[PDB]
């Protein structure tokens, strides 16, 4: 998934759009009206993260061999 995301982000007909840069894996340093480089203002910190949902718990329990390790939570 990261490899295909990076390759698609480099497609030379949508990368011309500045919107996909601040969206699909390009640090926002290229915006001129920005604060200077800060340890708290890093590109990774200001990125988006996931919302944990019981279906993600289902994925974790099935992908980590939950049949015998933790079956009660699986059921």
């Amino acid at each position: 998934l990261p490899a295909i995301n990076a390759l698609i982000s480099q497609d030379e007909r949508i990368s011309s759009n500045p919107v996909t840069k601040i969206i699909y894996g390009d640090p926002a340093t290229f915006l001129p009206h920005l604060p200077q480089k800060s340890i708290i203002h890093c590109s990774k910190i200001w990125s988006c993260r996931r919302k944990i949902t019981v279906e993600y718990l289902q994925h974790i329990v099935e992908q980590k061999n939950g049949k015998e390790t933790v079956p009660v939570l699986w059921h």
Binding site: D11, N17, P18, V19, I22, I23, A28, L31, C42, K44
Partner: protein
């Protein structure tokens, strides 16, 4: 291991007799007492196990693999002893004793079993120690004393001893354990953060200063800061969700906070200062921006926002146009994209929608109206791209041999090659048709080029492939007319359909035969056992 029951029953009685007088684990005295009980229980267990307390390797400070017994009864790693005892230091580093011959005597019946028993016992002890500190110290909403917090925070350190220094342990009250990498967990941080943020600032701030002064002096503190921000925002999310409160009061609270947000961007900025108050502030504004992203998504999907959420969005817009920290706007747009997709912000990147304030200034000035969609078919990589570029070049010109020349200059034979060719054809015709400026480009004396290529190139002159190609080239294929209404998932559904059709046509596999029958011979699937259906 039926070799510790009497000692641990004696320790059960010992902990019982020392628990009547202090039945309040939230203070320091019973926590210290039970910590000492676990520590000397481990010591006595090892003493009864393996001849008075086998110690870890002195060099790596960890358990020794393939143990070698020194004459002075010292257990060192085979790797450590082989890389340390070879030069002119033939002496035990702990007790200063010369080893006579060599590290030849190794035991394969006693030391390993004792080591595994010690590892099991320490694992259970540490696991239920952190269990107790999560439970006994956090029974209710009352915060514990400062002393117990200080003890549990200082337990993590392995501070200077005779010889790396200042590691970080995973809540182990013992010393015969080490990680030769300074790693900072979030379980203690999360447990502290479950309480109200006002009453735990000092403890988390002290821990932050300690790890900055002995673990993360000059390193990638960005990971640490994002970890702490995530923990703080998760804590406030749990506080809001678990508590008994509605949405309008939290909406007005967040609106007042945004309106009363003193910038203060120069306080913790320059190189090193990161106050827990600023971490709380950034977590709060990130939560507010996530709420704004959800509200914008709902507005795009539906009608107005009942005149109240519109006020919250207006306050968010005033904040964004007030503070110059565009990083928050970048976070908001990233959250919006992750929630819906790129086409969401592409539609929001139009020329007068009342949502352009969520975008930076340079992202709209030089953005044309020729913003197209990307081909999600780059999963192949390095060969589908070449054939699709050749197909685009052939579309631009009248020559049609470039695509064939590129196709014959690649690996991945006939099945996947035909899949690539058909997919590139579909992508080119779809890009031409969707764009109004270049509508019906192959019909402008270019369809003869592709037709001559089909008649000349026998790499796809299959009757099924031929009928698919003739249907797709003139847009007579019955997949484009899905007549959707949302105008967002129309293209996605159509491209799923065309890709699965191409896969089934080009997939000449036994398992794909029933799929081909379903997708191309429905009359034979009349009253057939359709998969993925419930049964009694």
């Amino acid at each position: 291991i039926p070799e510790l029951s009497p000692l641990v029953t004696t320790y059960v009685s010992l902990l019982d007799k020392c628990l009547e007088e202090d039945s309040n684990l939230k203070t320091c005295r019973p926590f210290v007492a039970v910590m000492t009980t676990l520590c000397d229980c481990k010591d006595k267990a090892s003493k009864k196990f393996s001849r008075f307390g086998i110690q870890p390797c002195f060099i790596c400070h960890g358990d020794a693999q393939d143990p070698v017994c020194l004459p002075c009864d010292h257990v060192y790693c085979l790797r450590c002893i082989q890389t340390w005892l070879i030069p002119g230091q033939m002496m035990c580093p702990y007790c200063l004793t010369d080893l006579p011959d060599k590290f030849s005597p190794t035991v394969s019946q006693d030391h390993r079993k004792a080591i595994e028993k010690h590892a099991q016992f320490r694992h259970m002890c540490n696991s239920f120690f952190v269990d107790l500190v999560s439970t006994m110290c956090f029974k209710d909403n009352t915060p514990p004393e400062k002393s117990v917090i200080d003890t549990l925070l200082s337990l993590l350190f392995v501070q200077k001893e005779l010889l790396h220094r200042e590691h970080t342990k995973s809540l182990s009250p013992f010393d015969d354990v080490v990680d030769q990498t300074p790693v900072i967990r979030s379980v203690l941080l999360k447990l502290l953060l479950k309480y109200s943020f006002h009453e735990v600032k000092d403890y988390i701030q002290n821990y932050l200063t300690q790890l900055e002064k002995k673990a993360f002096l000059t390193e990638d503190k960005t990971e640490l800061y994002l970890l702490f921000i995530s923990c703080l925002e998760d804590s406030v999310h749990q506080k809001t969700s678990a508590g008994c409160r509605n949405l309008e009061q939290v909406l007005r609270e967040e609106g007042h906070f945004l309106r009363t947000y003193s910038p203060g961007l120069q306080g913790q900025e320059p190189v090193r200062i990161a106050s827990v108050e600023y971490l709380q502030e950034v977590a709060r504004v990130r939560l507010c921006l996530d709420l704004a992203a959800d509200f914008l998504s709902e507005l795009q999907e539906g009608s107005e926002l009942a005149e109240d959420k519109r006020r919250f969005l207006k306050h968010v817009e005033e904040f964004c146009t007030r503070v110059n920290n565009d990083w928050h706007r970048v976070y908001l747009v990233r959250k919006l994209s992750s929630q819906r997709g790129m086409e969401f912000v592409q539609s929001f990147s139009k020329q007068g929608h009342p949502c352009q304030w969520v975008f930076p200034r340079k992202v709209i000035a030089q953005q044309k109206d020729h913003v197209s969609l990307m081909d999600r078919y780059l999963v192949h990589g390095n060969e589908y791209k070449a054939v699709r570029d050749a197909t685009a070049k052939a579309v631009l010109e009248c020559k049609t041999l470039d695509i064939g020349n590129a196709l014959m200059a690649c690996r991945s034979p006939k099945p996947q090659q035909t899949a690539y060719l058909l997919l590139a054809l579909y992508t080119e015709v779809a890009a031409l048709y969707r764009s109004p400026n270049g509508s019906l480009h192959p019909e402008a004396k270019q369809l003869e080029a592709v037709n001559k290529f089909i008649k000349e190139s026998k790499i796809l002159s299959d009757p099924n492939i031929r009928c698919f190609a003739r249907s797709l080239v003139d847009n007579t294929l019955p997949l484009l007319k899905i007549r959707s209404a949302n105008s967002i998932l129309k293209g996605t559904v159509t491209e799923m359909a065309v890709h699965v059709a191409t896969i089934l046509l080009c997939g000449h596999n036994q398992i794909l035969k029933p799929l081909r029958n379903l997708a191309f011979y429905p009359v034979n699937m009349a009253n057939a056992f359709l998969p993925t259906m419930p049964e009694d």
